[PDB]
Each structure stands twice: as structure tokens, then as C-alpha cells.
Design a protein around this ligand. Sequence first.
Ligand code: B12
Ligand SMILES: Nc1nc2c(ncn2[C@@H]2O[C@H](COP(=O)(O)OP(=O)(O)O)[C@@H](O)[C@H]2O)c(=O)[nH]1
Ligand SMILES: C[C@H]1O[C@@H](n2cnc3c(N)ncnc32)[C@H](O)[C@@H]1O
Ligand SMILES: [Mg+2]
Ligand SMILES: [Mg+2]
Lengths: 158, 1067, 233
Amino acid sequence: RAYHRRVVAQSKLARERQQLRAAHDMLQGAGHESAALETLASERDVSLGAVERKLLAMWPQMQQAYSGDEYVVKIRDKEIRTGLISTTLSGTKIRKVVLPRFEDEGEILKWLMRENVPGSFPYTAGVFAFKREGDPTRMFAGEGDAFRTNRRFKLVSE
Amino acid sequence: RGPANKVRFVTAASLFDGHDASINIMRRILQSQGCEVIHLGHNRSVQEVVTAALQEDVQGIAISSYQGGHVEYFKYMIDLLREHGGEHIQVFGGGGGVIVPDEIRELQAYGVARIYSPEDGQRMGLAGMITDMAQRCDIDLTRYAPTTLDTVVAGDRRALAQLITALENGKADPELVSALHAQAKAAAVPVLGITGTGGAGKSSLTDELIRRFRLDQDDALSIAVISIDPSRRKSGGALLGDRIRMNAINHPNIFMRSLATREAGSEISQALPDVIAACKAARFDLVIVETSGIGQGDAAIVPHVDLSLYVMTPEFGAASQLEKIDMLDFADFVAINKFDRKGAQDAWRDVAKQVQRNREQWHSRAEDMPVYGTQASRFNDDGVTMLYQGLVGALGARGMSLKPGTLPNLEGRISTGQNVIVPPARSRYLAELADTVRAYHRRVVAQSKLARERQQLRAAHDMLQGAGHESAALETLASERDVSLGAVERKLLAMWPQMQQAYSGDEYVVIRTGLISTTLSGTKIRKVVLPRFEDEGEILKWLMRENVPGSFPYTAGVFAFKREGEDPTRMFAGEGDAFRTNRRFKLVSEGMEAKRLSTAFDSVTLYGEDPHERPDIYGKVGNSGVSIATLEDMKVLYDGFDLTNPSTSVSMTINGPAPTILAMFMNTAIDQQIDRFRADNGRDPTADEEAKIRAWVLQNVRGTVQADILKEDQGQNTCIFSTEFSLKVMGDIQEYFVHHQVRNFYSVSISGYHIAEAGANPISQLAFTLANGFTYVEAYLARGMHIDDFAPNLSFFFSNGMDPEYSVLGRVARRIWAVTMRDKYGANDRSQKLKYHIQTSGRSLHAQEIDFNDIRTTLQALIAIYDNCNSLHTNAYDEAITTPTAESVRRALAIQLIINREWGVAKCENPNQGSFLIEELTDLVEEAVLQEFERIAERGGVLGAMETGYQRGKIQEESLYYEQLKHDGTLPIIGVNTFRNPNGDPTPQTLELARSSEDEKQSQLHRLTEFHGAHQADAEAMLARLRQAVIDNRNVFAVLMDAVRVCSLGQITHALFEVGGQYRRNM
Amino acid sequence: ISGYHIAEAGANPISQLAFTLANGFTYVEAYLARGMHIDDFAPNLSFFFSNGMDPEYSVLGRVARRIWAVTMRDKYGANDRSQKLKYHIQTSGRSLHAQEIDFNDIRTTLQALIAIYDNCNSLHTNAYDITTPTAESVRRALAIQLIINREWGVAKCENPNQGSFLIEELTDLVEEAVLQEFERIAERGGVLGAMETGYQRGKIQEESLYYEQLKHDGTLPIIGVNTFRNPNG
Ligand code: B12
Ligand SMILES: Nc1nc2c(ncn2[C@@H]2O[C@H](COP(=O)(O)OP(=O)(O)O)[C@@H](O)[C@H]2O)c(=O)[nH]1
Ligand SMILES: C[C@H]1O[C@@H](n2cnc3c(N)ncnc32)[C@H](O)[C@@H]1O
Ligand SMILES: [Mg+2]
Ligand SMILES: [Mg+2]
């Protein structure tokens, strides 16, 4: 419950911060220069947590990742590429992971904190980035004495 | 490197069968492997196919039979072949799961070469079957050819057909050839040549001209037709597609042979003078020759014929082009066909003046030149008759005895067909619709940006005042955007908080509706879940693109909440006679307060024919649907069902004879209330009382009739009359509906299910269907009906498959309709609401591992209900093999019951909304559809595309692409191309089948002859009135409302044939 | 940590999820009190749930994943590998009925679907059968997964649940419902303290009776059982 209370609060901050800097750019576009707005904005940069501030910061970089036809991520000294696209008989590109199209940074942060993409805290949509290809369907066997159960094991797992 | 000999095939679909999807992909492989294929299209009787194969002298016959009655059909064919010198011709067949293993062994034992099961297709592959089929027919037919002319001259038409195969292959003896030409010279018979540009209408005009010859001379003329089509030297074989257009050649005095050019360039067979001479010697009264699509500077037909006819369309570009056309210099007659096209009038004046110049007849009038404006697509066109009158006079002088005609010896050169379905002014209507939608979305973006900025400003304004430093400069920019926002958009955001309070409580006050369903855990599941956005930009964007169910643009559904008792379930039904089906109705609608019936008719009724004793027909009676032939049958069908009851709706799936069937239904509904009155008062109603009853029934009667003819040409192939005539009568029905305020019945179910099952992917299905629907709209607008008068009578029908796009198919169709109907056509709320029926994909189910089909049918049923459909049909597990059994229909009916009652997520009515995947897919599909609108629009609209066969072309392409993959493996199908059974048997034991009883067939025959005897006096009189209704161009349906009381289905259909014409197949 | 038997015994999805997470957290507290480090036993803990027809089952997995991840991070300060709750889902066998055994494949399909949608780690599918697990019966069960994973279109997307207004609202509701049940167990002396009183056993028994009641009552429709029965038997 404490975690959720924070999501609400940090979202309100992230929202207000955007709304201020948005109005600041719109005032300068008309001629009026009021830096009083910027003072309230910078005031909320500190109010936002360290973790939350970096979440919104990596959001545009996050979008570019899940946009292409592949997903490049370098582990160790090499790399691990994963396909993002499966194409239908109609020729439609079905992305493996579909990202939101919010403009409100309040909604972005709220979504990133409550339901991030699969493979990211709090792992609501899954603990792994992408599903395994291929299967851990175990081979179950157990009847009679140890001899009979063994043979079944050896037979099935041949 | 094709076959050893010249291998020829005749391909077709069985009598009253529309299933061409199978046979079409076979004639494609046949053609590619190097076989000449004489394709006859769908709906062909044994008498037709055999006559064709015998005149073409082919080695093989390929038939698809999916309607059942295939055992009787093929037996008849085998018998008829042996009787008339075609025993050496091999017959191949296929019907998927319909033809069970036992029937295959029986038919193959009878004489059939090979019938392929779905399991055969899996083992052998698509190419494997055709390779096997071709290698069998790889035989030299020249051995059966006559060595002397004795047989041919005597009148033997089979010997003639074989002598041609000898002459064409150059295996005829030189002394025989010269002897043939010698007698051909003394024969002195006229040879009419018909040439012209590709697709101008050479075949269609030829057929019509022949019909004129038959009507004028009482079929006293023996006509020989030699049609030539270009052969692609790459493959080896060709697609001889001229015979498919010929409807008037079915008669003993008519003979037709299809020749391939067998050269990449020349538009004539290298043996054409030999073939012509062969026909001359066979004592034919006239020989007609059609060339292939020739260039402008081609005229190779001239030296081989006695008279030449150049066929063209009004589209030839500049008038200066006519000086380049070599054929205008030699042609004795010029036919400007397709005179219904734009610019036909001016086209005639250019060609007339050009022919006048070429002949140097300055002392003659340009209007007197032998240039004719014809419209072969139009039944009994006066233009074509004018051309015929000219040809007769010319053939008369050239030594051809003929009786004084019985036709209207009219005057003029130009057709007077002034009918138009869609005015050329509105030609790009589909393109305009695409713009309308895209324009709407552009506004959503703009208004959202404004609504967002407006909020951001006033938000910052309140935050500045909270700190002290105030700047009213912000408010000036805010108020600036209050005006920028539209009136409609401003009120949308204004009502948002009030909207939230409505869907928040336990009830919805308007009338009260419950919002909450509580789970076993005690969780409140709201019927409609609203978004929790803070950004007013997102709120407006959502309110404009996907409002709650029951609000524009009705993306999430046209109604606020789903029906309380009346579930969307509506099960397709029909088997045996009207009595048996009436039991199946009671079975499906058992335990349901709301009676939602769905009727399927047998192939004989679907083609407007009465049941008859001939094995062609008899075997199909009562199979694959209920056999309905008279009004008395229709009455029995719905006995016990109050049709005028508010909670009872009947959906009858019928296309070609739809107006006739509809009249039967209406009469049934009316007669029910007359009977109900007669019981509640113990007396017949007075003439005034009956008038009130009859009028009331028409207003309140609730149901649906499919009748979509635009999809018949494209998809289902149930169009029997001419395409234009069907659309004419379809409008008559809607006009009748408006006059009598029939506001509860859907005059047409604009469908795509059939287009989809033919092979079309979800995008194609949705696009084509919406396009067809919009075509009807444009058609009725040009016809002078208020948009709010017929738009609420339009029902839709779609198919749900496994493809991702099917998940959002319905919601896309709802938005495209709502937006266009509002912005473009300016219709009211009731019109903007697209209501549709969804049926699970039948082609997605298989004959192998039939238990798996329930899994697929479940998933398809789920996304249908999620996406808030209005009506749902569920397919049985034995879908591939038979019509649903009693046990089979319950498993199908349970799928809906389980999802609707047991399934948890389903307790919410908008579960799709919000989903990132759904919203993205919705946007993608929508735009994909719009782009397809534009493709059709640049082909002249839906009608213009159908003229080219664009839809049929694309559907068949997609069907092949799918099928190539299903056998391939690239597209996994569990239990079919992967995860096969270790046993290897698809339904190993004997499954129960839904066929019709012998007694049931004899019942229908006896009921019919009894009905006929009852109205024997008024029968001929009524039919005469019906034809006069078409001639005098009155309302056809209005007469049908009386006709179905004294006439049978077949009687009416054949009567209309004499005055409405027959459908011309389109490959 | 399993909860298959708890649900199969009659517990509704909220009770099942709550009790199971509670049991899991009990093991954590138990291991910690032996002076052990959290990152040494947490990543290995596996979970085992049941999927039925109830609405809550649709978001059962995602709720279990968040409650674990948040608590393991904030409360116990464990690492990334520990915050990841992996679980196996097996379709509800209780919902499978003797009458009209062909209908069970329909229910098992729907249950298998929401399991895969909600990105489970392991799935077992129940047969349509009563009798012994025939090799034919196990193929129909095994085909359900194959069809959804290979043929089904929506399944080509790995997060189709995300964004859905219904899913997000249900996720929030279930989560809080579980938290409240934590508090009920906590004021009974924890999981062990409750077991001493037979609280869990008591509540499972009550819910089982309530279900079995509405079923007989005709209030909870079961196709082929209390409604749409076999016309012959
Ligand atoms: C697609 C389809 C349609 C489409 C047709 C589209 C078209 N333009 O062809 C539509 C939706 C229009 C349709 C309508 C109807 N249909 Co339908 N349709 C089907 C369906 C789903 C598949 C048939 C198909 O096209 N298969 C694709 C082919 C390529 O594959 P296959 O059949 O497995 O064939 C393989 C081999 O056998 C081989 N083979 C097959 N034919 C041939 C031919 C040759 C020459 C060769 C060499 C090989 C060969 O090739 C394939 C290799 O893999 C079937 C059910 C099913 N799944 O079998 C019902 C089905 C055939 N239809 C049926 C019915 C009843 C109808 C209707 C009459 C319903 C009604 N009362 O209105 C209508 C009217 C049809 C008409 N107008 O005449 C019933 C038949 C009942 C019976 N005979 O006992 C079926 C079985 C469905 C059912 N269970 O009720 N239909
Ligand atoms: N609009 C229009 N179409 C026609 C007319 N006559 C024939 N057609 C169509 O044109 C197409 C080709 O006809 P076809 O006879 O095969 O021409 P051919 O290939 O040159 O012999 C078909 O779709 C016909 O229905 C006509 O008078 N008007
Ligand atoms: C064309 C589609 O129509 C359906 N269909 C055809 N005939 C019947 C019938 N008598 N009963 C039920 N469904 C039928 C099948 O689902 C098929 O795939
Ligand atoms: Mg032609
Ligand atoms: Mg031609």
C-alpha cells in the first residue's frame, strides 16, 4: 500500500513538472517570458525521486528499443538479438511487446511503476523480457516398483 | 517440359454448387504444369459438363462437389460419358470431408478415376495431386480420330470434335485434309469472324448474338463456334476462358470448340483454316470465330472469314487513335460494346466518322455506317438486337436461307439502355469515404493537442497563484484555446465527469440498468469500465476514437448495454424437409425465452429450383439445408413460431432467389396473424380487418434476409439471374419496405463471411464488405431514397478466424461506418450504428482430428463476444464432414453458453478497451481497409472492379497463398501439418452424418405436384403478370408478394429467366 | 509453494492467492529466523496456482508477481533474481464435471488462454475425462496448448493483457483484496497462528459449501449440469 501511495505522489509531481515546462515553452512562443514558471518546475525536479526521475528519462530510449524489427542487448562481451515482429498472412506486423502511446508523463510514470514491460520491475507483465522459443513440459512417470518407473523414464526420454 | 501430348481438361463445380475455391486452385496448377483448361465455372449439371468435355475432346474432367449428392452426380456422369462415346475420358473429383472414404471407394469402383480426400492432399501435396491427375491423362487422343469424312459429314458431332483434335495436332492425313477443304469449298457456308481488344466483350456479345439467332429462328440454325484464347508459352498450356461466358450454346444444334493460340504472338491457331473447313463440311448453317485479345494493329482474322466484326469499348483514348487501328479498315461491322460506360456516345461518333472516312463514303451519312453501340451485359439489349438485324441482312445476301424473324425488327445503331446503378459523377465514392475517415482522425489529433495545452496552461496558472507569482498572461493563452476547441469537443470533455459518476454506481439511471456483477470471491465486476486518465488530451482522444458502448463513434458497440435475456446466439440450421428442420429449430431454441432462428436451404432451393427426379437434382434435395419449394413448405418450416412476436427473429440465408423466398416468409408471417385472428374470434376477418392485420404484420415482423448480390459475384456464387437484374429487384424490396414501413426487417445482410471462406484474409474481407455496403448506399441515394430511410435496414455479416486482425474486425467496421455515415452522408444516430452477425470460420476447422475444432471454435467465439457482436453462430466439431448432428450442435451451442454464463472476463462488456494491442491493431486494420478502398476506387468503384474481376482475382490469390502454406508447413495447423496422430486416422470409426431421408425426398415431390394441382388455373396467369412487371419496369417484389401464393419457387425463377436473364459467370 | 489443492478444495481465487502468498512469506520469515540471507533461498522458491472460470483468475498471476516483487525489494531488500516470482498454472479440475464430458475441453481452453496471456512460466492442461488418463485424452489436452501457442493470433503478442481497463482495474482490486486477507491472518497470529485455530481450513470449507450451494441452487449456471442438461441423461 505504501508503494502505491508513492506512485500516486510521484505521478502528480511528474505531471505538474511537465505541465509547467509545457506552459513555459508556450509563453515564450507568444513573446511573454515568465521564468517564475521554471522556478516551480525545478522545484519538482528535486521532489521526484532518483529512481523515478531515471524511469521517465529512459522512456524515449525504451520506445526506440521496442520499435524496430529486433531488440539488441549486449550481455558480457557479445550480444543477444531478439525478433520483435511476427507477420500475419495479411502482412500486418504484430509486435511481441506493445508499448503505450501516452503523452502525459504522469501516465507514463504511473504505468512504468505499476505495470512495466515484461522483464522489468515490478514484473507485472512477466519476469522475463520475451518468452522462450520452443518446452519445459516435464516427463511424468511413477507406478509399480522402482524398476517399472525407471523403464518408463528411459522410454519416454529416449 | 510439360506433358507428352496436348493434354486438355474440363473443370467445373457440381450442380447448384458454389464452392469454386477448391476447383480454382486446381485449374491453376493444371495450367502451370502445361495443360489447356476449359474452365466452366460453378453450378454445372452433368448434362453440361459432359457435353463440354465431348466437344472439346478432353482427356480429363475435374469436378468439385461440396453440396453432397455427389455419389448420384458422378455415377450419372460416368454413365452419360460411356453412353455417348467418352468412356476413355477420365473423371476426377473432390469435396473435402463431404465425400466420406466409403463413398470414394464406391465411386472409384464405379468408374471414377480418383477422388481426393483432405488426407490425400496432405500426403501428396497440392502439386502432387495435379501431377498424378495429369500423368494419368497424358494420352494421345488422335487414335480415336476418324480416317474418313463419312461420319463427320453425316452429322456426327463427336466425330467432328475428334477430327479437330487430329487436325489441330497435325496428325491428319494429307489426302484427308485436301479432301476436307474440297468439300468445305462446295459447302458454301458463311463464316463470321469476331475480333477485338482484350476483354471488350467478344465472348459475351457472341453468346448474345447466338441467343438472338435462336429466338429469331426457333433454334433451326446449326451454329459452330470456334473461340480462341492466348496461350502462355512459358507454362505450356492455356486458360481457354470463353466457354464460361456462353449461356446460349446449350442446345444440340450448337457446337463449340476452344482453341489455344499455341503461339505467344498470333491471335489465331496455326490450324484455324483447317478447323473452320472441318465445320463447313459438317453441314453447319453458320460458323462463328472469336479471336484472342488482339492489339490495335492486328487483323489476322480477316482473310479466314467471310464477315468480320470488330468489338471495342468507348475507352480508346484520343480520337486520333482510330487512324492507327488497322481493323477499322477491314471490319464489315463495328460493335462499340460496354455502351453503358462513360463517353460511349462520343465514342460512337468518332468511330462512325472514322469508318466513313476509311470507306470513302462521303455521300453517305455517318450515322448510316455499320457501327453499332451494344451492351452485351444487359439482357435483351436493343443495341445488340440492332447489330443482329444488320448481321442477318448481310448473311442473307451472302447465301444463307433464313425465315422471316420473330424479333423486333427495330431501327437505329445505338443502344438505349439508360439504367445506371452508380452515376459516373460518384465514381470515386470509396476514395471520398477514405478521405472522410482520415480527416476525422486528423481532427482528433488537433483537438486533443488543444485540449491538452488548455489544461496544461490552467494547471500552471493555479500552481503559480499557489506560490504567489501571478501571471494572467497564461490565462490569455488558455481562453485562446477555448475558442479553438470545437463546440462538440468542448462538450465532450465537459460531460466527462458527469459520465464517470454514471458508470460508477451499482445502477445506471436513464429506466434502470444494473452495472455490477459480483463474483464468488465478492469482487465487483463493472459492466463497462471507464479509463482513469488525468490528461484531458487523452480523455478527448479516447472519447472521439473509442467512446463507451452506445456512443459515437460506437467503436465498442452500438448499444449502451447488452440484452438482458436475449443472448446474441443464433444457430444456422437446415436439413431434410420443412418438417425435420422445424424440429431442429425447436431443439436450438429450446429453453430460450428469445427465439433467434437461422435457416439454411439446400442447394436446389439456393438456386431457385423445384425438386425433381433427375439424379442431377434429386440427390441434392434436402441435403445441406432445408428443401423449400412452395409457400406451404415455408409455413410448415416456421409453424409454432410467432414471427410477429417481438422476441422472435428469423434469419434466412438466401441470395439468388432471395426476393422470392422473402415473399414466402412475409406471406407466412401475415397468414399466421390471420389464423390467430380466426381463432380468437371464430370467424374470418373482414376485408377491412384483414387489411389492418396485414399492414401491422409488415411493420412489426422482425428478421433478416441476406440477398447481398455484390458478394455473389465476388464470393458465394449464388447469383442466378443477371447481376444487374438482381440489384434492380433488391432495390424494389427496399422500396417496398419503405412504403409499408417495414422497419424491423433487414432488407440485406451485407456479408463478407463468404468472401472470407473463399480464402480472403481478414483485411480483404472487411474492406470488400464495407465497400459493397457503401455501394448499396450510393446506389439507393442515386435512386432517390433518404439516407435515413434505408441505412437502418442494413445488416452486416462477418467471419471470425484465427488471424490477429479478427479480434478487432467488428470494432473497426463500426467506426468506419459511424464516422462516414455522420460526416459524409449526414445520416442520423440510428443509421451510424452498424449492426452485424459473426459466424466462426468454417474453413479453419478440419477433417483431421475433429475434436480439435472445438478448441478453435471456442477462441473464435470468445473474441466475437469480447468485441460486442450483435449475433453469433458457432460451428460444430464435425464441421468438415457434415451438417451439425444432434450431439454436434449441442457442443457448438455449449461454447456460447459457457462463455456467456460461466466465463469470468465475459461479465465485463468492454474488456477489449484500453488494451495497447487492441487499440494499435484497430488503427492498423482501419487504415489498411481505407487503402483498399482507394485501390477499388481507382478501378472504377466496386462495380468497376468486378468488371475486371479484381475482387475474385485477389480472393483467389490469397486463397492460394494460404493453401500453399497449409500444405507447406510454414503455417502450422495442429493435427494437420504438425502434431499428427501416431495412429494416422482422421475420425477412424463411423461418424453420424446429416443427410436427407428417401421418404423426405418423395414427400417434397408429392407436396409439389399437389401444390401445383391446387393452383393450376391461376399459375400461368400469375407468371405472365410477373414477366409484364419486369417488361413494364414496375416493382418486381410487389408482384412476388402475390406470386408465391399460386406459384412454386422453380416456376417463378424460370419465368424470370425469360425476362431477367441468367448470370454470366466471371472465372 | 502450492495452492492448487487449496483452490481445488473449494477456495475462491482471492482466498487461494492470499493463502498461498501468505504461506510463501511464512517460509521466508522461517528461513530468515535461522539467520539466513534472503538472496540464498528466495530465487529458488517456485509457485503453483489454479486457473478457473472466475474473473479474478485472469489477473491472478500478475498480482502474485507484483506483490512479491515489491515486498521482496522494499521490505526484505533482496536482489533482482529474488523479486521475480515464477509460477506454474494448472487448469481447474474441479470445474471439470462428469456430465457432458465433451464440454470440459471448452472450459479447459478458456482457462489455458488467460494463463498464457498473463505470461505464466509453466502450464498443465486437463483432459476432457472420470476414467484413466488415456493416451487419446492426453492428446486433446496437449492440443489445447499447441493450438493457442502456434495457431492463435492474439497469442503472437506477449503482453495482450496490458492496457486493458478491465485488467488493470481487476489487478488493483484483487491485490488489495489479498492485502486485506493478509491483515486478517496477521491478527490471528500469522499463518501458523491461524492454522492453530483452523482459520484457513474453516474458510476454505465455508467457500466450498457456498459454491456447492449456488450450484445446486441453480444460481450459478453450469452448462450441462444444472442447465442445458442432456435431454436423455
Ligand atoms: C469455404 C466454404 C464455403 C464458402 C465457399 C467459398 C467459395 N467461393 O468456394 C461459402 C461460405 C460461400 C460456403 C457456402 C455454403 N456452404 Co460451404 N463450406 C466451406 C468449407 C468451410 C471449406 C470448403 C473449402 O473451400 N475448402 C478448401 C479446399 C481447398 O480444401 P479441402 O476441402 O480440404 O480439399 C482438399 C482435397 O479434398 C482436395 N480436393 C478437394 N476438391 C478437389 C477437387 C479437385 C479437382 C482435386 C484434384 C482435388 C480436390 O484439395 C484439397 C487439398 O488440401 C466447408 C467445410 C470444410 N471445412 O470442409 C463448408 C461446407 C462444404 N459447406 C457446406 C454448405 C452446406 C454450404 C451452403 C450450402 C450453406 C447454405 N445452406 O447456404 C452454402 C452455399 C454454397 C453455394 N453457394 O452453393 C457444408 C456441406 C454439407 C454437406 N455437403 O453435407 C460444409 C461441409 C460445411 C458444414 N459442415 O455444414 N461454403
Ligand atoms: N459494363 C459492361 N460490361 C460488359 C459488357 N459486356 C460484357 N461485359 C463484361 O466484360 C467482361 C469480359 O467479357 P468477355 O465476354 O469475356 O470479353 P472477351 O474476353 O473480349 O471475350 C465480363 O465481366 C463481362 O461481364 C457491357 O456491355 N458492359
Ligand atoms: C458455409 C458455412 O455455413 C455453415 N453451415 C452450412 N450449412 C449448415 C447447416 N445446415 N447447419 C449449420 N451450419 C451450416 C458452416 O459453418 C459452413 O462453413
Ligand atoms: Mg473472350
Ligand atoms: Mg477470346
